Amino acid sequence: MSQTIHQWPATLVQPVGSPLSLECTVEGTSNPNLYWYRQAAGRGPQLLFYWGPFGQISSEVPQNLSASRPQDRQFILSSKKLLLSDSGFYLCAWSETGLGMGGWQFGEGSRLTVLEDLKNVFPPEVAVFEPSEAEISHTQKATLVCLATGFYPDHVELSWWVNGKEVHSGVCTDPQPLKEQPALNDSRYALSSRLRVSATFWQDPRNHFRCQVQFYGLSENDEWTQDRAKPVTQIVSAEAWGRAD
Amino acid sequence: MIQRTPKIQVYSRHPAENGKSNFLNCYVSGFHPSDIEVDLLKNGERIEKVEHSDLSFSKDWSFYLLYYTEFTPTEKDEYACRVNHVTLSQPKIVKWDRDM
Amino acid sequence: GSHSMRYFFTSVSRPGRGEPRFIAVGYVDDTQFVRFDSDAASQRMEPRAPWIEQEGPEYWDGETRKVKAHSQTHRVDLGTLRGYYNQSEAGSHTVQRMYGCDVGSDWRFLRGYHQYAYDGKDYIALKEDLRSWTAADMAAQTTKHKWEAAHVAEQLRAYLEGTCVEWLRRYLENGKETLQRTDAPKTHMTHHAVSDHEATLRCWALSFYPAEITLTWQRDGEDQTQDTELVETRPAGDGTFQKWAAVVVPSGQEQRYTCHVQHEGLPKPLTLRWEP
Amino acid sequence: ELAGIGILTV
Amino acid sequence: KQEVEQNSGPLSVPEGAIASLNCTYSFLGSQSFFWYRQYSGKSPELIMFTYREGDKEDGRFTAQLNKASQHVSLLIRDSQPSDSATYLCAVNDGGRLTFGDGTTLTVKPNIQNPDPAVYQLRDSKSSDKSVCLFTDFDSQTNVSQSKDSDVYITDKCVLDMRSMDFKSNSAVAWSNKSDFACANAFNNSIIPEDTFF
Numbered sequence: 001m002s003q004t005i006h007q008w009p010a011t012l013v014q015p016v017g018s019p020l021s022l023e024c025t026v027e028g029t030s031n032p033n034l035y036w037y038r039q040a041a042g043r044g045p046q047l048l049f050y051w052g053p054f055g056q057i058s059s060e061v062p063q064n065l066s067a068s069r070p071q072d073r074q075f076i077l078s079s080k081k082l083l084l085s086d087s088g089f090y091l092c093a094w095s096e097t098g099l100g101m102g103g104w105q106f107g108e109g110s111r112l113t114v115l116e117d118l119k120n121v122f123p124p125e126v127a128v129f130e131p132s133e134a135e136i137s138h139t140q141k142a143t144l145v146c147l148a149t150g151f152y153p154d155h156v157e158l159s160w161w162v163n164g165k166e167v168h169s170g171v172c173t174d175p176q177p178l179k180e181q182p183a184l185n186d187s188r189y190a191l192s193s194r195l196r197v198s199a200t201f202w203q204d205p206r207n208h209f210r211c212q213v214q215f216y217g218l219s220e221n222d223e224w225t226q227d228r229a230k231p232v233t234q235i236v237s238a239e240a241w242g243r244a245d
Numbered sequence: 246m247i248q249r250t251p252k253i254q255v256y257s258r259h260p261a262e263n264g265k266s267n268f269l270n271c272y273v274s275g276f277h278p279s280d281i282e283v284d285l286l287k288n289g290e291r292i293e294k295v296e297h298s299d300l301s302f303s304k305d306w307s308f309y310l311l312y313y314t315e316f317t318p319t320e321k322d323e324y325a326c327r328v329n330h331v332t333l334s335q336p337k338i339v340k341w342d343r344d345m
Numbered sequence: 346g347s348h349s350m351r352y353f354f355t356s357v358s359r360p361g362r363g364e365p366r367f368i369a370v371g372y373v374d375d376t377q378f379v380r381f382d383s384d385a386a387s388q389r390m391e392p393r394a395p396w397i398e399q400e401g402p403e404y405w406d407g408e409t410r411k412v413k414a415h416s417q418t419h420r421v422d423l424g425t426l427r428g429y430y431n432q433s434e435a436g437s438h439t440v441q442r443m444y445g446c447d448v449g450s451d452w453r454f455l456r457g458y459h460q461y462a463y464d465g466k467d468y469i470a471l472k473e474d475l476r477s478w479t480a481a482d483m484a485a486q487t488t489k490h491k492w493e494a495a496h497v498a499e500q501l502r503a504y505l506e507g508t509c510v511e512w513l514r515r516y517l518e519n520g521k522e523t524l525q526r527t528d529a530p531k532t533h534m535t536h537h538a539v540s541d542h543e544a545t546l547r548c549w550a551l552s553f554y555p556a557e558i559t560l561t562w563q564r565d566g567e568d569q570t571q572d573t574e575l576v577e578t579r580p581a582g583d584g585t586f587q588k589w590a591a592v593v594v595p596s597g598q599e600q601r602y603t604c605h606v607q608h609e610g611l612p613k614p615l616t617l618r619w620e621p
Numbered sequence: 622e623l624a625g626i627g628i629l630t631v
Numbered sequence: 632k633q634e635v636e637q638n639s640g641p642l643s644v645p646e647g648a649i650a651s652l653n654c655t656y657s658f659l660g661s662q663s664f665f666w667y668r669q670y671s672g673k674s675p676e677l678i679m680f681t682y683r684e685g686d687k688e689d690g691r692f693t694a695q696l697n698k699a700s701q702h703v704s705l706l707i708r709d710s711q712p713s714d715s716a717t718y719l720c721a722v723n724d725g726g727r728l729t730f731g732d733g734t735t736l737t738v739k740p741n742i743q744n745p746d747p748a749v750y751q752l753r754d755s756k757s758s759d760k761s762v763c764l765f766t767d768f769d770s771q772t773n774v775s776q777s778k779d780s781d782v783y784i785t786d787k788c789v790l791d792m793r794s795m796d797f798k799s800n801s802a803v804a805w806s807n808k809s810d811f812a813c814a815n816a817f818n819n820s821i822i823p824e825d826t827f828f
Contacts, residue, residue: 046730052413053420054420057413057414057726058727096630099411099415099418099628100497101663102759104728106677106678107674127754127758129754130754131752134748134750135748145752155672169794172789178783194801198794200510238756247465254577256579258582258583259581261550268582270581272580278437280357299368299382300355301377302355302441306441328453344547345576352623407724408623408725411624415628418628425630468631469828495629497629500627504626504627504682507684509624547627622660
């Protein structure tokens, strides 16, 4: 009825040399086996630590990482000083005590991006484009397009809100962002999504459309030298209202 | 709970030949719990550096261990095995006999 | 002939010193091939026979992880069982587990086992059908219900009938020089009086392998198990086994008795008889 | 080869 | 790595077809096996596990184990666009799971009645960009990048208006340069309508 596992934080962007602290919590079982895996793009999760209920079982030795289990159902992954190499998707998992088939489920994962130079960080500019009358007339549907551009690092969570409530029907968001300048190693990124509704629903000025983009950036206290306001974690959005023909 | 008193045999790995190397054994079996004191004595003197097998047990869950040390038998030295266990009121000494 | 693979696990709680002592040992027939001791510096599954050292580091790593996982499960069990038997945190308690395979002369599966004991008594065992559980008492019922909800037997059915035999076959092949050998018993017979008109004739069987062996005396046809007190078969320490039988009799005549030995390593059963 | 499945707490 | 091998894909399967995913492991002592599904940006989610030879079905999913050849398969019946993802094979090699790198599966939606077209959208704000939208095309139409670094063009993605029981493909292209026009925005179209006053 309720075996659960959650990790936090979901996403982190930090500079080289900073400390790390990821947390993992479980619920609905006692004395479980806990595991920390890290996954690199294009690859399968790779084991870091395997802890039984009373201590570490794996003899595995990550270079700049350490694990701890300050409570039966609480598991922690730390680092005193992060290396660029440490960028990855950190996943926590659990299995029933012993060696059986119970469990074997992952938490939601913690995406870590370690940066060399923070001046490369930029939040996304967001813009929504309203349907064309030609579409409305050829078909009887209206497609809005939201464009999140100029962001770095390469992760954002786009979201569409119609009249205060988040929507999912008729929504299609690019799975991965595109590099605005492919040749550059530090290129900024872009992402787009479409929201399709009937011409009738668009043509109603009562309807409010909003494209919302959560961005993960620097923390308030990160070292900064640039002239522009620090690019911390923030939501950037753009809006549009229905138009009568 | 069940406690089981040990059986004991003290003997040599090979036929004892006066002046030829060998191993003095003491096999304790059929006991529980596993905590047990076994000593190999030479003229009633605790023989140091005695090694033993890895704890194991049989169908009835009773344990067995083999204690052994190298030695060289003679016509005047006396060898024995001293065993103590919670099931015994007193430590038990079984003397080594060239035969048996 | 038949062969088997067995694993034995013992965990003893030492409330006051620290974690429980855990010792695991693996056997193929009467030969120990691996061990693990929670108190050893090693902290690895270690080999105890030359033919297992041929397995690569992947195998060892895997066996080490599993054995430690076994250890920690036994740790949780020790805490659960006190609760079940409403016992205090003061005393020392023991948990033992054993499972393994039996294959015939054709190396096909004959039977599997998985048993568990608490403080020296049966707690729960998997029956011959590899599907039912024999729970000794009420506490063990709680355990059998949870093991039934998780289909532990079905998992053990896969391991005991498949994996355990597959690896038993693999080991018998890799260690053929040791496991498939057969050491015939070397025998001799001593004799010396204990008093006038009294003398104990003693028969010996040494350096034999496997351990299964029969050492019986005969004046003529026994008809029933004779009163000759035979010593329990014991390990030489070098991988072989030994056993002796003795009889006291009238000094004068001594050709009245004949020691008989039967072992797999001997085609014809031996019949010794001498009067020193 | 140790059992890698069917081993659970009592 | 080489302990657990899976083709990488992308493997295309038409909607409604059976998708078959294969995995080969090298660790002889592997006693249980698992399949996970992992969507872009998400953590993997358990699909099934198995510890015995043969097949094991759970809904549309069927896992197959053959220890002799150390092969594990996964069949997905009645494939849908929503099962587009990376499928990870994992072997339990002693108290833990070791993973393959996965095979990426792409299920192309079956577009009933397509009407490809390129439309130009303006923004509700004053932006230096203009966007072109190629939509309603058959799922056999592949969209490619522009031969111009100034323009950007997304890959095709599928949206489902659950209310009309209608699926639909799209591709967006944009550029802040005046030149850029929707008539020349794309490459290898399929005779769509290009509207204009």
